[PDB]
Tab-separated table of C-alpha atoms and ligand atoms in Angstrom:
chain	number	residue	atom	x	y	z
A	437	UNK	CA	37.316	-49.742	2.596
A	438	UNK	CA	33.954	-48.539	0.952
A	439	UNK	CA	31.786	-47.048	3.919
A	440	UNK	CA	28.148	-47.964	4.238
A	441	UNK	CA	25.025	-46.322	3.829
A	442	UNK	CA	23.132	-43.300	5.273
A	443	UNK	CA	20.762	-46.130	6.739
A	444	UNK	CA	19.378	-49.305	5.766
A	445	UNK	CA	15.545	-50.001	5.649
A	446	UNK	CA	12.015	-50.449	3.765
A	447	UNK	CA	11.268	-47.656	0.974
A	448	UNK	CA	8.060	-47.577	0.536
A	449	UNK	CA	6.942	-47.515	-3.225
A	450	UNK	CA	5.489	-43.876	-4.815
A	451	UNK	CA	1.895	-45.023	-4.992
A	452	UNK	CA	2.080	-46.778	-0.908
A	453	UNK	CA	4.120	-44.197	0.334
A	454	UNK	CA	1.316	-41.735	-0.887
A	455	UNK	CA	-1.611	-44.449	0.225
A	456	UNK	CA	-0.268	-43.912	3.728
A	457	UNK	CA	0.890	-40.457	3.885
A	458	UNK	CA	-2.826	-39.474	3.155
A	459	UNK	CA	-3.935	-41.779	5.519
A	460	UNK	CA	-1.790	-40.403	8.325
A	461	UNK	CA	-2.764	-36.622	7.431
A	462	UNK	CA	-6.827	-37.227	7.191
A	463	UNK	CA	-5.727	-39.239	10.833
A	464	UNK	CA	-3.985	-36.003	12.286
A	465	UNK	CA	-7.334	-34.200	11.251
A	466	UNK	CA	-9.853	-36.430	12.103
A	467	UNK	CA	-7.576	-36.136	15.980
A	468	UNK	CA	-7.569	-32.726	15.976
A	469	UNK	CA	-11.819	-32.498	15.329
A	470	UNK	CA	-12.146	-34.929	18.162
A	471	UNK	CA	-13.819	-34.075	21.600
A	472	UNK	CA	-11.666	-36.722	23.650
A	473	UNK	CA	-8.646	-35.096	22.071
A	474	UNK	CA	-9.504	-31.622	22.661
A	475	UNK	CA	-10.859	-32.107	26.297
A	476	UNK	CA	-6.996	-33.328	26.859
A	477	UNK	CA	-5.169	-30.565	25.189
A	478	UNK	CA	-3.818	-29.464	28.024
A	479	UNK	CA	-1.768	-33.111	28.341
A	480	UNK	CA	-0.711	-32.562	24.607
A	481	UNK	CA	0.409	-29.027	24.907
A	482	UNK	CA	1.391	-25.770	27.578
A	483	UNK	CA	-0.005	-23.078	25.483
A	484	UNK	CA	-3.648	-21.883	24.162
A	485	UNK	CA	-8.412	-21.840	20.280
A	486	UNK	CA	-7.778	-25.387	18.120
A	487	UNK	CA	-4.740	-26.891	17.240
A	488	UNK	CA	-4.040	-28.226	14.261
A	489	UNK	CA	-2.227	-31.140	13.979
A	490	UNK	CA	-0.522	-30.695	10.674
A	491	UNK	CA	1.083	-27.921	11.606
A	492	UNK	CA	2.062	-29.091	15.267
A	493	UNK	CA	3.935	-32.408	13.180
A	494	UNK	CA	5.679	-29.318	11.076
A	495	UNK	CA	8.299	-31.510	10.018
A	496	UNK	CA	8.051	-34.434	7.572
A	497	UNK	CA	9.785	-36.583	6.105
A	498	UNK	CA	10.440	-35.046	2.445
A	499	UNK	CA	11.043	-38.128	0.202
A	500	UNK	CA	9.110	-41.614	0.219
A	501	UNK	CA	8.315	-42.570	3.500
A	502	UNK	CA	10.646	-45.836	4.862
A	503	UNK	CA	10.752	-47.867	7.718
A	504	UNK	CA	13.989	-48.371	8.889
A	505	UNK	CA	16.268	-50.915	9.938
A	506	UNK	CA	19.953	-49.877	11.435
A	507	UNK	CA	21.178	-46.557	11.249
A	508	UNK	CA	24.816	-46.125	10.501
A	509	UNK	CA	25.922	-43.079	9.478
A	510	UNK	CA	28.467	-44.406	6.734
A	511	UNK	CA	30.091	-46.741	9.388
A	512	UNK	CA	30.500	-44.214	11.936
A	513	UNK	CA	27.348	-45.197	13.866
A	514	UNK	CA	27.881	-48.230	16.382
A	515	UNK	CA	27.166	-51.850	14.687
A	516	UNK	CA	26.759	-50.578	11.269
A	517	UNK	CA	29.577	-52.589	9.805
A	518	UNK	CA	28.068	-55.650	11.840
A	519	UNK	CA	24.831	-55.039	11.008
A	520	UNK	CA	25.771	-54.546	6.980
A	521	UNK	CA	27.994	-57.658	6.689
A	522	UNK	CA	25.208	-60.164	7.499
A	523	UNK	CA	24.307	-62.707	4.680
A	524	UNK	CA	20.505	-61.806	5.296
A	525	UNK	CA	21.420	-58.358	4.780
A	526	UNK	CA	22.968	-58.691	1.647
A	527	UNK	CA	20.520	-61.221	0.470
A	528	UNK	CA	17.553	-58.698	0.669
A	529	UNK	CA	19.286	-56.080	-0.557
A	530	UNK	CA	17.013	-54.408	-3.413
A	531	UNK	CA	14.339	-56.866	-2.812
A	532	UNK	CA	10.415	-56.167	-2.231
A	533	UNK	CA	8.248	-56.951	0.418
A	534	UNK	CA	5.276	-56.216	2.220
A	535	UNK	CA	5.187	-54.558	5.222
A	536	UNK	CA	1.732	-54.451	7.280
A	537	UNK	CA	0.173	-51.201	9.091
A	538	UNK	CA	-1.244	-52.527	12.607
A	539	UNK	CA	-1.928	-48.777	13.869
A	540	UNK	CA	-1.756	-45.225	13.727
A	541	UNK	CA	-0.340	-43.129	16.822
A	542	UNK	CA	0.343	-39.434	17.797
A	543	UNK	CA	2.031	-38.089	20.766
A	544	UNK	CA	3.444	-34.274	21.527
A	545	UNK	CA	6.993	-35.290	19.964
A	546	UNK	CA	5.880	-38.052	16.977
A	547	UNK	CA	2.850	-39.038	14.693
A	548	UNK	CA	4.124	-42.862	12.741
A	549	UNK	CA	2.708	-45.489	11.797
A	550	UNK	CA	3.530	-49.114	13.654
A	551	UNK	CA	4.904	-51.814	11.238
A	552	UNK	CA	4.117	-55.373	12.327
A	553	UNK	CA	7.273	-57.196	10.947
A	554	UNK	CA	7.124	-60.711	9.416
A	555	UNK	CA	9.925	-63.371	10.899
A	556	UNK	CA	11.670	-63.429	7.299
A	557	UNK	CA	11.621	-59.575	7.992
A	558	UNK	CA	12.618	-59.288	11.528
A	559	UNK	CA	16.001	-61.015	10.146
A	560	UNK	CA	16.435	-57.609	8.663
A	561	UNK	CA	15.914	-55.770	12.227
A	562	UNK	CA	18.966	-54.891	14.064
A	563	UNK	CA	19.719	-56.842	17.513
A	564	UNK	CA	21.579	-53.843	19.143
A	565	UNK	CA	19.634	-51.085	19.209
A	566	UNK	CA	19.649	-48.309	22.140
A	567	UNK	CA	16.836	-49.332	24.058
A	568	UNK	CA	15.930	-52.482	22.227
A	569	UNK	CA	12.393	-54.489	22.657
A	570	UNK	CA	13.653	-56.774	24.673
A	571	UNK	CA	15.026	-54.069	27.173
A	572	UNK	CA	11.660	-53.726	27.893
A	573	UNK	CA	10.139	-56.888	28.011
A	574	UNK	CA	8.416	-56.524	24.101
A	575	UNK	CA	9.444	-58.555	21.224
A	576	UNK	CA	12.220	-57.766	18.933
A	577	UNK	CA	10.894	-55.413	16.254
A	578	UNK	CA	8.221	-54.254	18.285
A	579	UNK	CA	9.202	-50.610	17.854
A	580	UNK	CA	9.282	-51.261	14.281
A	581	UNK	CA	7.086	-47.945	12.504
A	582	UNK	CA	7.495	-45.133	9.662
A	583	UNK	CA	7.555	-41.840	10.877
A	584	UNK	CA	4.949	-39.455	9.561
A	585	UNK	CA	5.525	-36.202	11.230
A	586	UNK	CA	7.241	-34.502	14.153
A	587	UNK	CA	7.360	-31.392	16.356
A	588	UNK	CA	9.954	-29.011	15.310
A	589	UNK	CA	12.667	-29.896	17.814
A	590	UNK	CA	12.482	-33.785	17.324
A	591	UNK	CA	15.081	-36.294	15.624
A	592	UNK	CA	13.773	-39.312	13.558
A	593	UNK	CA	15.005	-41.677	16.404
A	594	UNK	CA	12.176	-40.442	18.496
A	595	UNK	CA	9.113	-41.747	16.425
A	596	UNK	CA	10.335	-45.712	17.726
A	597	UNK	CA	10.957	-44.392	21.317
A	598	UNK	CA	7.589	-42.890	21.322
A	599	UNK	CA	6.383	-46.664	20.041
A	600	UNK	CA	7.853	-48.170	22.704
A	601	UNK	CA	6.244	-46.281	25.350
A	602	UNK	CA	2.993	-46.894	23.870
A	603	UNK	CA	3.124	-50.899	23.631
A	604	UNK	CA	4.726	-50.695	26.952
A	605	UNK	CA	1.889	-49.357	28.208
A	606	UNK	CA	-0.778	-51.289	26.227
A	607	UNK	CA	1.002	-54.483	27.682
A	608	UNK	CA	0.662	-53.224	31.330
A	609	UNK	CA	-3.296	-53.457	30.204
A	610	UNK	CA	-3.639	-49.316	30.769
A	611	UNK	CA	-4.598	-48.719	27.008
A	612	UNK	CA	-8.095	-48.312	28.338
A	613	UNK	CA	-11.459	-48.387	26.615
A	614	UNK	CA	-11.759	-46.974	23.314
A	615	UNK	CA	-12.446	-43.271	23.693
A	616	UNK	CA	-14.005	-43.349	19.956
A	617	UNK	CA	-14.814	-45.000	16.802
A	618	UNK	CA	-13.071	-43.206	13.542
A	619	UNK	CA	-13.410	-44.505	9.859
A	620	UNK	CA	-10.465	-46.482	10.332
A	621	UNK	CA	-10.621	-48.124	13.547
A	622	UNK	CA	-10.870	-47.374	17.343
A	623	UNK	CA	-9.385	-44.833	19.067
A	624	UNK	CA	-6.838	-44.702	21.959
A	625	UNK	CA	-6.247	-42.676	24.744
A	626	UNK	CA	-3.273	-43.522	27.009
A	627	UNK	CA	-2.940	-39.925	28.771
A	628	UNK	CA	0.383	-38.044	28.443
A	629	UNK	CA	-0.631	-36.641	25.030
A	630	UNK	CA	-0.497	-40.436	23.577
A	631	UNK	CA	-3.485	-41.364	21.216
A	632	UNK	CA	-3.391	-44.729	19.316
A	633	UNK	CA	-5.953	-45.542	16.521
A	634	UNK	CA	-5.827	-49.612	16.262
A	635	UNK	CA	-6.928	-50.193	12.399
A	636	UNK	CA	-9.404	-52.448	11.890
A	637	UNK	CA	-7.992	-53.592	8.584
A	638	UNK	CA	-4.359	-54.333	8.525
A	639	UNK	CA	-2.455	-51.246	5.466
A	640	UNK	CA	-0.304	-53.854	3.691
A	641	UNK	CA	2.305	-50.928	1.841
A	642	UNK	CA	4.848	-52.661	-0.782
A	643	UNK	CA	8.821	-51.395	-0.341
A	644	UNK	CA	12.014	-52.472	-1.389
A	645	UNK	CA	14.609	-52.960	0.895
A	646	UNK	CA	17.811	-51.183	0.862
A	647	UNK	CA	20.243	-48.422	1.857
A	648	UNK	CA	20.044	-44.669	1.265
A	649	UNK	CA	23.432	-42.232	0.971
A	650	UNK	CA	22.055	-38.745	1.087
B	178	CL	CL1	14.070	-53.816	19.007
């Protein structure tokens, strides 16, 4: 039988992989330089003067950044060969589309970027995912994102976990009043190390669907 790939998602063309990349770096220093952020340092982090953000997320991904769909580990991960065998899947394979940017978010295990999936691209997102959306009372594809960075001891899985936990939050109304205005948008503080910066204009980044082998 021919196994599957690595993963399936959205690779994110050179020049909008690099439009967002930048974006998410001059975000992790524009953080960093912030007086709400520093006052809370002691939510993000249990050891002291400034930290740098870029080198706390001191692992990134190395090639275009993607936003991905199922995991499955060459068939050995569970519902990969479901997931794989679906007419959408097949459909969209090697096919562009547009993916849109709603926000920007850091916590003291992730820094990604939340995708805002279209219904012609939520066919795409898997329906049996550990700790789905719906587990939680959010929308399928909710935890949709492209990682940007992590801490040293993370795994890529985290980056939608940490998503999660943020929507969760904002839907239980606790995302509280902006703690400041940056270029982009305003800026987030849900306590626990968890920052969100909601863009005021949507990033639309172009990406071709499809499956990577390693
Ligand atoms: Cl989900």
């Amino acid at each position: 039988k021919d196994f599957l790939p690595l993963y399936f998602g959205w690779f994110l063309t050179k020049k909008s992989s690099e439009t967002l990349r930048k974006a998410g770096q001059v975000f992790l220093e524009e953080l960093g330089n912030h007086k709400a952020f520093k006052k809370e340092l002691r939510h993000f982090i249990s050891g002291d003067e400034k930290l740098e953000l870029v080198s706390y997320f001191g692992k990134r991904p190395p090639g275009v950044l993607h936003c991905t769909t199922k995991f499955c580990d060459y068939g050995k991960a569970a519902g990969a060969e479901e997931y794989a065998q679906q007419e959408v899947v097949k459909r969209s394979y090697g096919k562009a589309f547009k993916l849109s940017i709603s926000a920007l978010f850091v916590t003291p295990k992730t820094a990604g970027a939340q995708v805002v999936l279209t219904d012609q691209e939520l066919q795409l997102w898997p329906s049996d995912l550990d700790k789905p959306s719906a587990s939680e009372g959010l929308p399928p594809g909710s935890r949709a994102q492209v990682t940007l960075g992590c801490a040293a001891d993370v795994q890529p899985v985290q980056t939608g976990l940490d998503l999660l936990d943020i929507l969760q939050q904002v839907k239980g109304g606790s995302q509280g009043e902006a703690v400041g205005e940056l270029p982009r948008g305003k800026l987030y503080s849900l306590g626990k190390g968890r920052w969100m910066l909601s863009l005021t204009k949507k990033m639309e980044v172009k990406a071709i669907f499809t499956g990577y082998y390693g």
